[PDB]
Amino acid sequence: NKYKLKDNIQDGVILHCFDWTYNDIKAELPKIAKAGFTSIQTSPAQPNGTGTWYWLYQPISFSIGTNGVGTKAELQSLCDEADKYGIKIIVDVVANHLRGDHNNIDNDLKPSEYWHTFGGGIDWKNRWQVTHGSIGMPDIATENPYVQQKVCNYVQELKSVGVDGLRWDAAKHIGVPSEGDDFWKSVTQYGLYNYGEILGGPDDRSTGNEDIMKEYTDYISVTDSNYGKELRDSFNSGKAPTSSGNWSEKGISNDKLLYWGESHDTWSNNKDWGFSNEMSQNVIDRAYAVAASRNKVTALYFSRPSSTNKESIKMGEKGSTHFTSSEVAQINKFHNAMDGKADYYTVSDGCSVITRKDGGAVIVKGSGSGEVSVENGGGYAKPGTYTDAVSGNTFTITSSTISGTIGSSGIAVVYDA
């Protein structure tokens, strides 16, 4: 374990080489290991439609097949090689529907009883319709024990091929046990690492929704749209995020949470929400730096496709390699060391500024780079003079402030290299 990769994943950091093959991922593991990532998200392993990337996100079954990033055997081999590094296998799964017309799917799920048959016309404040409307694409009867059994059989297949953890799409549209939906029990029983997809809270109402987020997070860690909003807003407007983390400021525990530089969705469909496919590398990396900085919040880097439109972006390609950059590289070994050296979050000097107790620090300006004289958040970061890992310039930490010249990343980071 040359690069000291972790056992953990929530207390951990992730890459998605977005629809790069198993073989691509497998071959680059030495490099990914030098780049310090403990874990890797991958797209759903079922048999699929090909080409336009979402045809993997529209699989015919809840079973592994040969697929747009390779065979089941190549996945296993990736699992094997990852385990030679000890690297952790994360698989993305779309639970709440298979391929968008039922006539294509697993024949034992085709019957209407396996679906929430409410169809379109969801009021986004109606929690039940949000969890029960087929959005043109189906909406599965997620509370149904056999719907859970189908997913269980797939999760068993995934763990049987050495999958170490999972991501869940459409978690907003999945229920909770108080809504009769033990789906979460039915997947967490596999003892896997997990997290889930939510945007705009559990539904778009003001209040009480926090308790639905609690009941979800009693099983899972989760995404955040409104942190994503202020992130995209702030760093595209050349500003740092004023919040340290939105739903944790709404009282949720950090081990229940994830943030990103961008979601694949905010690049991979169309620009009204796909907007990041026309917003800069070193604009959006600003958000990645803030996200990965947070203690016990889990975090992911994303490989930007060869294309900037829903119809134009495809599966089966080696996307952008900006993870080879200094900033993305520094962020990971920083996590690896600063795990358990808890954080203080601030904004200082027009930057998010984050300091790790008896440990390192991060600075992230809303835009640009240069000299800084930022607050040592809570006095957490260890006083001393160091190389800033990001620029290679000299930086100094003191009990009150940190200083030095930030590189064009707009991001600076320090540790005992």
Helical ranges in 237-280 per DSSP H = 246-249, 265-268, 271-274
Q: Which residue has the tokens 């945007």?
A: 199
As a dihedral over the C-alpha atoms of residue 168, residue 20, residue 279, residue 92, rounded to 10 degrees, the angle is: 0
Parallel, antiparallel or unpaired: strands 384-387 and 394-397: antiparallel
- What is the DSSP track for 50-64? -SBGGGTSS-S-SS-
Provide the 8-state DSSP code for 359: B
Experimental method: cryo-EM
In CATH, the number for domain 344-414 is 2.60.40.1180
Judging by beta carbons within 10 Å of its beta carbon (0-12, 13-18, 19+), is residue 103 exposed, middle or buried?
Answer: exposed
Identify the sign of the CA torsion 112, 116, 118, 121: negative
**Calpha distance 135→100 (Å, rounded):** 9
Q: How crowded is residue 242: how many other Cβ atoms within 10 Å of its Cβ?
A: 10
Resolution (A): 4.6
**Calpha distance 375→194 (Å, rounded):** 35
- Tokens at residue 337, please? 């060391």
Find the helix or strand (DSSP H, E) in which 301 lies. strand 298-302
Phi/psi for 224 (5° steps) reads -150, 110
Class of domain 13-340: alpha beta
Residue/partner pairs of 339-345 with CB below 8 Å, 24 or more apart: 339/6, 339/8, 339/11, 339/12, 340/11, 341/295, 341/380, 342/295, 342/380, 343/293, 343/294, 343/295, 343/377, 343/380, 344/377, 344/378, 344/380, 345/244, 345/245, 345/293, 345/294, 345/377
Q: Which residue has the tokens 């017309």?
A: 101
Catalogue the E-assigned strands of 36-87: 39-42
**Calpha distance 340→343 (Å, rounded):** 9
Among the listed residues 365, 372, 275, the one whose alpha carbon sits nearest the alpha carbon of residue 327 = 365
**Calpha distance 254→245 (Å, rounded):** 9
Q: In the chain, which residues fall in CATH 2.60.40.1180?
A: 344-414
Find the helix or strand (DSSP H, E) in which 232 lies. helix 225-236
User: Preceding residues of all breaks in the chain (C to N beyond 2.5 angstroms)?
Assistant: none
Among the listed residues 355, 373, 369, the one whose alpha carbon sits nearest the alpha carbon of residue 413 = 355
Find the helix or strand (DSSP H, E) in which 151 lies. helix 145-160
Residue 323 CA to chain centroid, in angstroms? 15
**Calpha distance 225→202 (Å, rounded):** 11
Among the listed residues 375, 340, 331, 336, the one whose alpha carbon sits nearest the alpha carbon of residue 355 = 375
- Close Cβ partners of 171 (under 8 Å, ≥ 6 residues apart): 196, 197, 198, 216, 220, 222
- Tokens at residue 41, please? 């998200």
- Tokens at residue 277, please? 């496919």
Does residue 295 contact residue 244 with C-beta atoms inside 8 Å? no
Provide the 8-state DSSP code for 389: T
Q: In the chain, which residues fall in CATH 3.20.20.80?
A: 13-340
As a dihedral over the C-alpha atoms of residue 27, residue 41, residue 230, residue 337, rounded to 10 degrees, the angle is: -70
Find the helix or strand (DSSP H, E) in which 362 lies. strand 361-365
